Amino acid sequence: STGSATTTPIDSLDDAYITPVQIGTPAQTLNLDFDTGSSDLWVFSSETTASEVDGQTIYTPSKSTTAKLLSGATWSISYGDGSSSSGDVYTDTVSVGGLTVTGQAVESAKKVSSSFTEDSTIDGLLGLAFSTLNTVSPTQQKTFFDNAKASLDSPVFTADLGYHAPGTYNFGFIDTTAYTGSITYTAVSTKQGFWEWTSTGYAVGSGTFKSTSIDGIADTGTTLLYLPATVVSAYWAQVSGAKSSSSVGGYVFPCSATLPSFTFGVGSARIVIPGDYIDFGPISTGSSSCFGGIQSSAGIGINIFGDVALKAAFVVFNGATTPTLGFASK
């Protein structure tokens, strides 16, 4: 089997992407944030504290003839950005782009943090990291991909995120029309539960390539590119007037600037992030200070190849017995 679904930016900055997901019988379609940095499929629901729901579409398990309470199971998650959610668990039928999993754990939120409430466009998350990170207790549950994998034509999914435009998540096949040149594959460590890999270096603009190993994670659920402070300083030094602002919470730059590109290495291959992908716009409405899309990972504890990086590539998440990651230009 295969599946193919369009993923759509939630706003004009590509702050996140939402993908429609069918849950239950009859289908209830929710727009979920596909997150290769976590491993829980959780939704706003009829159980979510009413004051914490503000415009989201909810899953109502009592209206699904295939929903079953997973007795005694609870979940609770905290994300790198400080947001969180928790609740109980149902199993139900879940379909993405024509690919159906029966008996998928659907984690129903009883509580969500303010950041989730305040974002009316995201009805929940669909985790695509390794199932070892799943938070369900006392019986850990599998991700949608893990459940689907054996049925897929090939045990892979691909992320093809758009810049200021829709893109595609495919399951079970590689669309050879969706990228240019070849796909370069690179080793993955699953030791921390992430799609963790090592970039071979970077360049700023038309500058020379610096060969240096940068361990980090491919994370569709993180907006920005978080890299070591040395790399980030080298980038922003090429933008007149850019500075790190403790008050704003990262590098800012004059909105009048033209940003240089940023290149990262995948083996001997190179992925170029155009300068415009690194612009996250005014820090507040009407400001002439703009927020940068490349930020320091210092104090996160891990480097994160988030959407800024991934949307410059066609990315293969290869879930074979020994997982790997592939990147192609597009």
CATH number of the structural domain spanning residue 100: 2.40.70.10
* Interatomic CA distance for residues 45 and 60, integer angstroms: 6
| One domain, residues 155 and 222 | no
Residue 286 structure tokens: 């009407």
* Interatomic CA distance for residues 250 and 293, integer angstroms: 10
Residues 6+ positions from 103 with CB-CB distance below 8 Å = 91, 92, 93, 147
Q: What are the two backbone dihedrals, phi and then psi, of residue 163, each rounded to the nearest 5 degrees?
A: -90, 115
| One domain, residues 127 and 60 | yes
Residue ending a domain, among 141, 174, 207, is: 174
Residue ending a domain, among 150, 174, 198, is: 174
Q: How many domains does the chain have?
A: 2
| One domain, residues 73 and 120 | yes
Residue 35 structure tokens: 């997150």
Annotated catalytic residue within 45, 64, 85, 199: 199
Residue 130 structure tokens: 């390794």
Report the DSSP beta bridge partners of residue 125. Answer: 33, 42
| One domain, residues 70 and 179 | no
Residue ending a domain, among 148, 174, 200, is: 174
> Quick check: is 199 catalytic?
yes
Residue 229 structure tokens: 């402070």
Residue 181, exposed/middle/buried by CB under 10 A (0-12, 13-18, 19+)? exposed
62: which DSSP letter? G
| One domain, residues 119 and 202 | no
| One domain, residues 278 and 320 | yes
| One domain, residues 196 and 101 | no
Per the entry, the structure determination technique was X-ray
| One domain, residues 156 and 205 | no
In order, the DSSP letters of 315-329 are EEEE-SSS-EEEEE-
b/e per residue, 204-218, with b = 16+ CB within 10 A?
A: beeeeebeeebebbb
Judged by DSSP in three states, 257 sits in coil
| One domain, residues 187 and 315 | yes
**Contacts of range 170-178, beta carbons closer than 8 Å, 24 or more positions apart:** 170/2, 170/3, 170/4, 170/97, 171/2, 171/3, 171/4, 171/96, 171/97, 171/99, 171/145, 172/1, 172/2, 172/3, 172/99, 172/148, 173/2, 174/316, 178/314, 178/330
* Interatomic CA distance for residues 128 and 252, integer angstroms: 31
Judged by DSSP in three states, 63 sits in helix
* Interatomic CA distance for residues 1 and 151, integer angstroms: 6
Show the domain range for 17. Answer: 5-174
| One domain, residues 205 and 290 | yes
Evaluate whether 68 touches 160 at the Cβ level (below 8 Å).
no
| One domain, residues 109 and 148 | yes
* Interatomic CA distance for residues 41 and 131, integer angstroms: 11
Annotated catalytic residue within 35, 40, 160, 219: 35
* Interatomic CA distance for residues 212 and 246, integer angstroms: 28
Residue 90, exposed/middle/buried by CB under 10 A (0-12, 13-18, 19+)? buried
| One domain, residues 220 and 113 | no
